[PDB]
Paper text:
We solved the crystal structure of unliganded human DNPH1 and took advantage of the slow reactivity of 2′-deoxyuridine 5′-monophosphate (dUMP) as a substrate to obtain a crystal structure of the DNPH1:dUMP Michaelis complex. To investigate the structural basis for catalysis of N-ribosidic bond cleavage, the structures of unbound HsDNPH1Trunc and dUMP-bound complex were solved with data to 1.7 and 1.42 Å resolution, respectively. Omit (Fobs–Fcalc) maps showed electron density for dUMP but only in half of the binding sites of the dimer. The 5′-PO42– group of dUMP makes polar contacts with the main chain −NH of Ile29, Arg30, Gly31, and Gly100, the Ser98 −OH of one subunit, and the Ser128 −OH of the adjacent subunit. The dUMP 3′-OH donates an H-bond to one of the O atoms of Glu104 −COO– and accepts an H-bond from Gly27 −NH. The other O atom of Glu104 −COO– is locked in an apparent LBHB with the Tyr24 −OH. The uracil moiety of dUMP makes nonpolar contact with Ile76 of one subunit, and its 2-CO group makes a polar interaction with the −OH of Ser128 of the adjacent subunit. Glu104 −COO– sits underneath the 2′-deoxyribose moiety of dUMP, 3.8 Å away from the dUMP C1′, a position suitable for nucleophilic attack on the anomeric carbon of the substrate. The main change reflected in the active site upon dUMP binding is the stabilization of the Ile29–Glu34 loop via polar interactions with the 5′-PO42– group, with the side chain of Arg30 closing as a lid over the substrate. An intriguing hypothesis for this observation invokes the enzyme harnessing the binding energy for the 5′-PO42– group to drive a conformational change that traps the substrate in a caged Michaelis complex conducive to catalysis.
Author numbering:
A (entry chain A): 19 to 28, 35 to 54, 71 to 158
B (entry chain B): 18 to 54, 71 to 159
């Protein structure tokens, strides 16, 4: 009955701010490692939008984004240039401005960016 | 083609700490096949083309990397044969998404020590 949102993230305060604001727009869907992987894959397939905070390098976040692209999901990636890091070319280079968006942001504005996207 | 096409993935923008090991792996992979591996878009598109051409995808997954994870996720969805190599001597716990993707056949994750990487590759490709 509500949109289904999937959040990926490797910072705790910013993650909590993002997850809390996502609840305005829908349900945020997000044993052993295999059971974790299969539950995450099931939630990815159910998701209407996949949101990832990509400032911290993470194999798991990258993997989730790769699976999400192959499932043809709408994807929003959020990067903080103030980190001083250069974002992976595989993530920056996947952006097409519509179905796969990569947005640079300053920490104070993250809720305004999500409101604009949703 | 004649030779198996091999795709190698390792951290770059996530960190170049293991660059010298990557060269040793690529050197041994060359024994068993052809190693195939707007600036960011061009890197993404060429890498995806090589990934699609690959018969085997080999990834060193010790250093956390968005790009290596992304390549592995696209490779799984392309139903590629995948070998991931992880070094427990790093002190790291490998991401559950990578460890949990392993099925022991088409997606394998092997723990190894740096000194045995040539013997590991010889066994996998035998
Ligand atoms: O500038 C580059 C060149 C290659 N790759 C591809 C090939 C590597 O296997 C992997 C490294 O990803 P990062 O560590 O740069 O995120 O992605 C990049 O992401 N960025």
């Amino acid at each position: 009955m509500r949109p289904a949102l999937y959040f990926c993230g490797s910072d705790r305060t910013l993650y909590e701010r993002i997850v809390s604001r996502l609840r305005r727009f829908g349900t945020v869907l997000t044993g052993g490692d295999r059971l974790i992987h299969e539950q995450d894959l099931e939630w990815l397939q159910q998701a209407d939008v996949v949101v990832a905070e990509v400032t911290q390098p993470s194999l798991g976040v990258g993997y989730e984004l790769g699976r999400a692209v192959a499932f043809n999901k709408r994807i929003l990636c959020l990067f903080r240039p103030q980190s001083g890091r250069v974002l992976s070319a595989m993530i920056r280079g996947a952006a097409d401005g519509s179905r796969f968006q990569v947005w640079d942001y300053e920490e104070g504005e993250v809720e305004a960016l999500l409101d604009r996207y949703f």
